[PDB]
Specification:
Number of strands: 30
Order of helices and strands: EEEEEEEEEEEEEEEEEEEEEEEEEEEEEE
Strand order of the largest sheet: 1-30-29-28
Largest sheet: 4 strands, antiparallel
Radius of gyration: 19 Å
Strand content: over 45%
Distance between the termini: 8 Å
Helix content: under 10%
Structural class: mainly beta
Shape: globular
Bound molecules: the ligand N#Cc1cccc2c1CC[C@H]2NC(=O)c1ccc(Nc2ncnc3ccccc23)cc1
Length: 336
């Protein structure tokens, strides 16, 4: 046991499958979004209580907490808008239209220093997700676009974004299965390589930032050498219920969810990784036998888990696991 489990609670205010659930930067609030466009904002320490609740008139695809103003939440729509929501004042500060032909705001990342954010904006899905997309850099102080990064070889939908600790690097994964790493000082692509057969769903810097981790449609979790483009450090086939597609089957009726939120999350120092499964969160130790072996199973879910988070605050771990029945389990972990 590398962790003791201090409790497992259920947040149940959503009645639809969860799309995203993320802990804020203070580590004390959750923002969660379901497929019916219900945004909920809630605390959990010492009990679960709801701070805000709103139906979006518009489809909502993405969610990102601000880094340097804890109470601000960025929301990306399916109608080409970025909304800035004040969780404390329970009102929208602004909603900016993206003056373009790319309505799907698939991914939002706020810079660590708080002066900037990035969003991906994609064309409509085809009657694949292998469609044109853009990557936009914004100024948080004006909430205006500054520039778009050209994507080679072609405009492509970007599914996932993450900054490094300082914010000078941004790693992205796209629907063409390619990872693109951007130098955010020079505003150019430092590095790119083919990462997955099919889509990249999540990307993350290792704690030490010598590697980035990725998970994608081919079912593989891969660790890449940030110093040498496309050189793998290690590669594992996760169980299929880590990357879906996620099915809840009734009389010939089923609900199907393709990955959209973050499929993996890490402890404070990046030694352990939480993933999805039919029946709850599954945690692995990083670092490297041939078959990656599971050290902890959080359980507690009676419908597929589709997205997860992991935050550490007051020296305690909080794991979120969110399933297709709309339930969010909040498990509390102590690192011995
Ligand atoms: N860390 C972080 C971080 C992340 C995202 C955001 C922000 C931060 C820190 C600063 C904060 N920005 C703001 O609070 C804000 C709020 C509104 C405005 N702009 C407008 N407000 C009203 N009407 C407008 C109409 C047309 C255009 C613009 C408008 C600018 C900044």
């Amino acid at each position: 046991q590398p962790f003791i489990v201090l409790g497992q609670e259920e947040y149940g205010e959503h009645h639809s499958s969860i799309m995203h659930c993320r802990v804020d930067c203070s580590g004390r609030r959750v923002a969660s979004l379901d497929v019916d466009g219900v945004i909920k904002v809630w605390s959990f320490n010492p009990i679960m209580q709801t701070k805000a609740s709103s139906i979006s008139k518009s489809p909502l695809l993405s969610l990102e907490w601000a880094t340097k103003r804890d109470r601000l939440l960025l929301l990306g729509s399916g109608v080409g808008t970025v909304r800035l929501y004040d969780t404390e004042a329970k009102k929208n500060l602004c909603e900016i239209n993206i003056n373009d032909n790319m309505p799907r705001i698939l991914s939002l990342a706020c810079s660590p220093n708080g002066a900037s954010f990035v969003c991906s904006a994609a064309a409509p899905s085809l009657t694949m997700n292998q469609v044109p997309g853009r990557l936009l850099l914004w100024d948080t102080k004006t909430m205006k676009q500054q520039l778009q990064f050209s994507l080679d070889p072609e405009p492509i939908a970007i599914n996932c974004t993450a900054f490094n600790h300082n914010g000078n690097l941004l790693v992205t994964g796209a629907a063409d299965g390619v990872i693109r790493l951007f130098d955010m000082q020079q505003h150019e692509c430092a590095m790119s390589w083919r990462a997955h057969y099919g889509e990249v769903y999540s990307v993350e810097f290792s704690y030490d930032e010598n590697t980035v981790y990725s998970i994608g449609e081919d079912g593989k979790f891969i660790q890449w050498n940030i110093h040498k483009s496309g050189l793998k450090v290690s590669e594992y086939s996760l169980p299929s219920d880590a990357t879906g597609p996620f099915v809840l089957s009734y009389s010939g009726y089923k609900q199907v969810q393709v990955p959209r939120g973050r499929l993996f999350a890490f402890d404070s120092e990046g030694n352990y990784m939480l993933t999805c499964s039919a029946t709850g969160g599954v945690i692995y130790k990083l670092g490297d036998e041939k078959v990656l072996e599971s050290c902890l199973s959080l359980g507690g879910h009676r419908a597929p888990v589709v997205t997860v988070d992991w935050s550490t605050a007051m020296d305690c771990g909080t794991c979120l696991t969110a399933s297709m029945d709309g339930k969010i389990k909040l498990t509390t972990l102590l690192a011995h």
